[PDB]
Amino acid sequence: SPEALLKQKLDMCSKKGDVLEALRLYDEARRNGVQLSQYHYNVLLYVCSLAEAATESSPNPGLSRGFDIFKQMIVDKVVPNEATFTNGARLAVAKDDPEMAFDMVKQMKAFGIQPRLRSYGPALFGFCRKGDADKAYEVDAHMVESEVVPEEPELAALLKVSMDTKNADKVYKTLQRLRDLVRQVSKSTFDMIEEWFKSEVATKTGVKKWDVKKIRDAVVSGGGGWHGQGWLGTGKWNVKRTEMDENGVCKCCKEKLVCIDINPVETETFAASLTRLACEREVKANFNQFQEWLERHGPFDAVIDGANMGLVNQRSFSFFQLNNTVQRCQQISPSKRLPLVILHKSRVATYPKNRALLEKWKNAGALYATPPGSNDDWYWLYAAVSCKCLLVTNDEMRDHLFQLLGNSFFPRWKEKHQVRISVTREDGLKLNMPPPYSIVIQESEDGTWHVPMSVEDDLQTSRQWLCAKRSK
Ligand SMILES: *C1=CC(=O)c2cccc(O)c2C1=O
Ligand SMILES: [Cl-]
Ligand SMILES: [Cl-]
Ligand SMILES: [Mn+2]
Ligand SMILES: [Zn+2]
Numbered sequence: 001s002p003e004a005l006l007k008q009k010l011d012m013c014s015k016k017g018d019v020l021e022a023l024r025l026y027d028e029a030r031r032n033g034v035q036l037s038q039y040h041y042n043v044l045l046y047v048c049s050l051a052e053a054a055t056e057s058s059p060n061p062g063l064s065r066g067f068d069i070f071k072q073m074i075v076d077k078v079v080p081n082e083a084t085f086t087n088g089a090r091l092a093v094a095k096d097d098p099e100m101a102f103d104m105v106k107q108m109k110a111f112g113i114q115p116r117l118r119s120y121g122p123a124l125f126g127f128c129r130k131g132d133a134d135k136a137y138e139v140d141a142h143m144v145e146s147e148v149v150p151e152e153p154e155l156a157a158l159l160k161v162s163m164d165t166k167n168a169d170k171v172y173k174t175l176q177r178l179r180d181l182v183r184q185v186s187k188s189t190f191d192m193i194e195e196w197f198k199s200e201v202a203t204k205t206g207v208k209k210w211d212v213k214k215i216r217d218a219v220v221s222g223g224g225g226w227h228g229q230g231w232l233g234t235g236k237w238n239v240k241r242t243e244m245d246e247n248g249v250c251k252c253c254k255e256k257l258v259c260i261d262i263n264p265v266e267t268e269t270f271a272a273s274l275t276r277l278a279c280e281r282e283v284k285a286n287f288n289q290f291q292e293w294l295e296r297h298g299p300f301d302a303v304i305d306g307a308n309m310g311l312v313n314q315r316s317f318s319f320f321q322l323n324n325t326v327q328r329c330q331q332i333s334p335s336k337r338l339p340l341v342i343l344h345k346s347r348v349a350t351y352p353k354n355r356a357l358l359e360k361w362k363n364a365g366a367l368y369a370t371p372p373g374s375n376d377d378w379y380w381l382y383a384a385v386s387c388k389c390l391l392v393t394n395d396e397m398r399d400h401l402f403q404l405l406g407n408s409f410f411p412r413w414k415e416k417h418q419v420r421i422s423v424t425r426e427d428g429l430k431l432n433m434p435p436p437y438s439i440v441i442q443e444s445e446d447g448t449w450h451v452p453m454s455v456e457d458d459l460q461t462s463r464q465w466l467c468a469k470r471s472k
Contacts, residue, residue: 002034010043019062022047026069038081041073045087049094059095066091067100074107085116092119098126102139109146117148128157133165151407152182156189163196168205168231171196175449176228179441183411184454190466193451197239197468206234206447206470215445224260225442232447233470242467244450248437252467255448260438262412270409271385277404278378286371290379294386297365298340301333302419303384305393306343307376312394313423317347319354324429325421326361329392332431338366339392342380345369377401384417392419392431396457415439422459432459439463 006029013022022044029036048069051062070088092101101122105115120143127135140158143150150158155178162170175193178185185193196202210232218227240252248257278287309325310317322341329339341361348358348369361367368383370376377395384391397414420432439458442450451466 002029002032003037003040006034006036006040007043010040010047014043014047017047017050019047019051023061023065026065036073036076036078038078038084041069041078042081042083042087044069045073045084045091049087049090051094053094053096063091063095067095067104070104071107074111074113077111080108080113082116085119089116089118089122092122095122096126098123098130098132098135098139101126102135102142105139105142109142115146115148117143117151117154120148121154124154125157128161131161131164133161133167133170136161137170149181150177152178152186152189155182156186156192159189159192159196163192163199163201166201168201171202172231175441176226176443179226179443181408182454183440184452185441186454190451190453190464194239194241194466197237197449197466203236206231208234212445219445223263225258225438225440227443227445233472235470235472238467238469238471240467242465243462244437244465246435248435250450250465250467253448253469255444255450257437257442257450259436260412260440262409262416266409267385267388267413270405270413271382274378274382274385274405278382281401282374282378283371286374287378287382290368290370290382293368294383298387299337300340300366300383300387300389301337302329302339302390302392303380303387304329304339304341305376305380305391305395306341306347308393308395309421310347312421317349319349319351321421321423321429323354323357325392325431328429328431329390329419338364340383340387341367342376342383343367343369344374344376345371375401385413389417390419390434391417392421394420412438420459 006025009025010022013019013025026044029040045066048062048066051060051066053063054060070091073084088104092104095101105119105123108115108119120139124136124139127139136158140150155174159171159174159178162174178189207230210229215227215229215232218229222228242250242252244250244257248259249255250257275287275291304322304325306322309322310319312321314321326339326341330336333339338361343358348362348367349355358367362369368379370379380391380393397418402410415438416434418434422430422432424430439452441452444450447470449466449468451468453464455461455463
């Protein structure tokens with residue numbers, strides 16, 4: 001077959017980085033009357049993106065033709081897949097022309113194709129590198145219209161370009177978008193934000209007089225932790241790196257951070273999504289069986305990730321650590337409920353009295369053994385969300401299948417529900433409870449800002465905060 005033969009030769013081309021040969025095969029196919037599929041185009045976009053950007057001559061046919069191939073792909077109305085968008089962006093990155101990168105996205109739009117976040121990157125980051133705020137903001141508005149949500153790198157570059165063009169209104173807006181969408185910021189974004197607050201433009205932006213009750217209403221209206229009404233105060237900002245104590249009080253300024261509620265409707269939506277995701281990956285009957293078991297049991301104040309409690313910081317499964325955690329969860333339950341222990345069925349172990357206790361917990365309605373081949377992470381997560389209770393796990397809950405859960409609701413839910421164990425020589429096991437405040441960028445009623453850094457493990461490393469408060 002002609003298509004089959006092209007594919008083979010393009011795959012060979014892609015294996016060898018043979019861009020000149022891929023371009024000749026592209027032309028030969030046009031001369032032979034062979035129609036290019038989605039697959040064919042995707043290999044060419046990738047192959048073309050291996051071509052260098054020329055400093056010392058006019059652009060090379062590799063990059064130059066890649067863009068013509070992209071435009072021809074879209075005119076054909078070949079249905080894109082995830083490799084299309086990826087390769088399209090690789091080509092855009094290779095070229096380093098934000099305007100042409102932006103052109104590709106405008107083309108997609110014109111032919112009813114939904115662009116991906118990574119399609120916009122080359123445009124945004126390019127325009128941001130060149131200091132062209134106006135075009136960066138055009139790219140941003142375009143993402144917004146296309147309902148593609150930015151992540152931190154995009155928000156950070158917008159922040160940086162706003163700082164570069166002295167655009168204090170845009171700095172403020174991006175800061176709110178970081179609050180809303182990212183919550184805690186990377187080291188590089190943290191440093192950027194500290195620079196902003198120490199800068200002359202920041203010193204010279206503000207108001208001495210404002211409507212105290214209009215701030216009041218916006219605070220109530222936003223959900224708490226911010227007002228969104230603009231920069232307040234005047235003069236130099238006092239900007240310190242600092243920490244919050246255990247009650248959410250800033251050690252620099254003594255402001256008590258707020259605790260922000262989760263709307264129970266978001267929680268219901270999330271619970272549905274969670275069921276939907278689990279059924280796609282689990283054997284439906286296995287997850288349904290747990291749902292039906294759960295409906296018949298409880299109530300629960302805590303759900304334990306048994307495997308994690310057995311294995312965190314251990315060279316092998318520690319029944320002691322599991323059992324000690326169960327006892328401690330029961331001790332903090334106001335009515336002394338046993339926690340729901342989720343374990344794989346291969347455990348339920350080697351010592352007779354431990355086996356008897358596992359069986360006793362099962363007989364008490366407080367243990368569920370997840371079936372052969374299941375991923376027990378779905379089970380403990382669905383249980384804690386459904387029961388609206390504490391979740392006891394040291395699992396980081398970021399990598400692999402937890403990415404499916406998203407980055408708005410789930411992190412907020414985690415913060416309010418997750419209990420982590422820590423162990424010291426002197427004291428043994430401790431339960432580290434949800435904090436009595438929200439770890440998020442916060443803007444107070446008087447215009448004071450507290451900005452938290454993101455960390456791998458906030459029990460391992462004490463979390464750094466920025467405290468930005470007007471000196472008058
Ligand atoms: C926010 C505020 C608060 O006082 C509190 C107390 C106990 C447990 C929590 O999760 C919270 C909270 O999230
Ligand atoms: Cl109760
Ligand atoms: Cl005993
Ligand atoms: Mn696990
Ligand atoms: Zn403070």
